[PDB]
Amino acid sequence: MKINFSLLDEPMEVNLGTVLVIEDVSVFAQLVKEFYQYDEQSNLTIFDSKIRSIRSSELLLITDILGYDINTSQVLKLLHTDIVSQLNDKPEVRSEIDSLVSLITDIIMAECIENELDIEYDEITLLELIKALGVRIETKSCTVFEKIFEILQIFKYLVKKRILVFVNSLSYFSKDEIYQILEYTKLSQADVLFLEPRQIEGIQQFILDKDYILMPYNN
């Protein structure tokens, strides 16, 4: 997952988490505007190993952390499917749940037989039980750090998003929290690109000087 712009000499590769610091406010604002307008502008080009350019629908752009909605129909559906798989991996728990749902089905069936009208039904499944329970992620009481962590957790659930990009999101988190975010990103394998005006001390990042020189920086 390499990204390239006219200011760079060679296309830079983005693997796992990547912290890109732009020391020039003009190039930074122009790059962010090229991130929002990316479908319209040909200056910023992001391509994969196949050299194929990714569509703006495949690109995931995030600036406001707490304003973004983490709960979507696809995210909640795939999450319910993941929970159903977790319950399916354990035979004993699935057997017990089947027993309980079977008892409830017996009760409701008796109540239906007691009625004068002829009533038919099918089944009460586990996905219907989860949908009836209303399982969803809670962003209401979550701190910004837990919000970005939940975004990194649900990025695997998003199928269409090729790369996640954060705009000036590293100013809220402490150095240790940034270390946790990067160390978790290395395990999640997702491609995350952070854009900050000022360099963060203690983490590996790519620095773009006002001279338009891109250099790797350990601190």
Partner: peptide, 21 residues
């Protein structure tokens, strides 16, 4: 003017924030 100069494809590349030529 302040800018960065590179060499690409037998072409002098003038790169600046405002424009490139």
């Amino acid at each position: 003017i302040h800018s960065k100069l590179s060499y690409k494809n037998n072409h002098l590349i003038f790169r600046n924030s405002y424009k490139t030529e």
